[PDB]
Design a protein around this nucleic acid. Sequence first.
RNA 1: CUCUAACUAUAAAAAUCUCUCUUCUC
Lengths: 129, 206, 78, 102, 64, 150
Amino acid sequence: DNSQVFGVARIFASFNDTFVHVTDLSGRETIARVTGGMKVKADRDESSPYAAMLAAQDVAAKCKEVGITAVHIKIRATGGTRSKTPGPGGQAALRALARSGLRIGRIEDVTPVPSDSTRKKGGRRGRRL
Amino acid sequence: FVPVELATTIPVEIQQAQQEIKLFNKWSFEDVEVKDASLVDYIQISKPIYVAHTAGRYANKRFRKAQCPIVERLTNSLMMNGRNNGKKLKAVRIVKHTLEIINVLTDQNPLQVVVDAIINSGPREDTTRVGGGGAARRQAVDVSPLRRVNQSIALLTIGAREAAFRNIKTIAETLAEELINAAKGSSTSYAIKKKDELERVAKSNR
Amino acid sequence: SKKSHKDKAKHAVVLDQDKFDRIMKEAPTYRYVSVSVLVDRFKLGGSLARVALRHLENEGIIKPVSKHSKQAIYTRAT
Amino acid sequence: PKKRASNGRNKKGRGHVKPVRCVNCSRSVPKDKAIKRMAIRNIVEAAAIRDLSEASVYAEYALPKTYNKLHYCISCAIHARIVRVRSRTDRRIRAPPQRPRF
Amino acid sequence: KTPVTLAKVIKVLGRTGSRGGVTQVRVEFLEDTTRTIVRNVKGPVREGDILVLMESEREARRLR
Amino acid sequence: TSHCRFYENKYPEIDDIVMVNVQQIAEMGAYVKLLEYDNIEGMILLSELSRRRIRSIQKLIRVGKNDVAVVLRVDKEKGYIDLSKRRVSSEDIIKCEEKYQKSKTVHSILRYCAEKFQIPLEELYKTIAWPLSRKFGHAYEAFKLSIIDE
RNA sequence: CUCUAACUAUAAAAAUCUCUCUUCUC
Ligand SMILES: [Mg+2]
Ligand SMILES: [Mg+2]
Ligand SMILES: [Mg+2]
Ligand SMILES: [Mg+2]
Ligand SMILES: [Zn+2]
């Protein structure tokens, strides 16, 4: 316990436009919401790993500016009724937050899993791409 | 300095002490340095030659193309436009003139200058055709060192030719001034300008 | 196609005495000298570019480095 | 002609089974003809464990794994290569692909 | 801030791409003998070259 | 002698909206001149060209005509522009179309002024246009109030 | 004659088609 003031990065990684949003332990106080679509232009690449690194590096910079040094992780897919699977980008954001100075510990997944309700969007035959 | 009598009198500068092989009996490969640590082993300044034209089997194998003397690759790449595909003698004369020009402009023994120009103008990132049909995109890819050398040669010679086309200035001197611009970061050079453009397109499409 | 170049003579076909003064004091301050450069300074048309350059080899004003045709490469007496 | 003796359903004595939505295209399919994969993976990819390993508090952290089944409609199962279009005599082999690594 | 880094290729991981003209390799950095990373390369490479990477950590994947 | 850009600084800015005259197309789009700022060129890139899929490259560009534009990252060292055409909002195009025509008229007048006075445009915009743009936000409104108020 | 550990990541659009059908016996 060498005074690692803690944070929770709470990457929310969807199949498009992932999120990195570091807040206090209680989660009440936000620090650098800055997201995936913040730093990319295509709007198709919002989920791309490069968006993850860009968002992660800038939120890490803001993290050093404020003072937070150690971070716990709340990885979250879209969850609910949608696909239950972590977004492609968010993993790259995890890697970047690991790299850029920040100390990391206590990795957790908090994807909201339902207990079978709220009939999934799409109809019977479902998406028919 | 130690001349040898024979029945046939070899001239002064050819017979004197020339166990010190020079490019055109003028410029030495010694003191020539490779700045970037990568492209060493991809340029053959280690091998001294007396002319910039040695017709050897340098393309049958996968990688023997790298053993070619760099000056000869430059020569062989001067000849473009289709019509002037051959005529190496023309290319070697042009490159010899250009080496003399580089000897004029910034004495710096020209071979170092051309090597530095080659090193600088290499594009470290390229793009690739990846987008499938509908949502076409431009992927960013790293580049081979050997491909960097070959690309540098191609862009330099292309800039020289486009500078010389229907222009009072000659190919030898246009090549020389392009090499001078390319030794430094003189963006006036067409080659470095295209290298920058390619790098930027790759970067903006990471 | 259209003659949209908008180019004037852009050289000198017949010299001036003032032009001769220009070339005479001009051999200094131009360390690289070639017929191309001499035309480039709007002062020589090019037909007489070689004529003038060869004239500069009257007092050894500019020594040759390589006297091959198709060009001319010279450097001042120093 | 009956393509599969097991009728390709695996219901065989149940009348009717609750439906489950596909994971990609969300097509509802009986929970038995509902090709299904245990997607167990380390929360971090093995390619990036080392960066985590030497730059983290809590020396020798658990590095947990994420668990979930995936339920596909067979259309997705075929197109997304989860299930291949096997040959005739090779259809009646139900053993998984020889425990991919062993 | 020009972090031009150098990575010597230690192993070549096949050739990918729809064109088939790109090659993925595992490269170990010249400095920091510890780290290795997988990256794409355009143009021929063999075991021992030195890739000049502007960017370091953008580990690309198999490309279709 | 046409020069001396319309707004304060020579180089484009962050997320600014401009318009472009197009001249040339090599592979990745068109590095072509501006006529909202000085006369510099800029890259229009194909992945960021048009809303629909890029079916043809000749039709949508129209070499030698005026087109919408937005600059992403300004090369404030040498004079390069990374420029876009797709990501300009439908309401944003028309309001920039104004700004652009707004800028053009002042130059059209001060051109005539310079050509008849043979003073380079730079001095005229320095002396007249910039103080007007500072005082009234636009040299066009300054000209309109000049018509009314001396 | 002793055993049960790995893992990824695609889908844009493509409509139609005029004839002429002819033996096997040593
Ligand atoms: Mg289908
Ligand atoms: Mg019963
Ligand atoms: Mg089944
Ligand atoms: Mg019809
Ligand atoms: Zn499905």
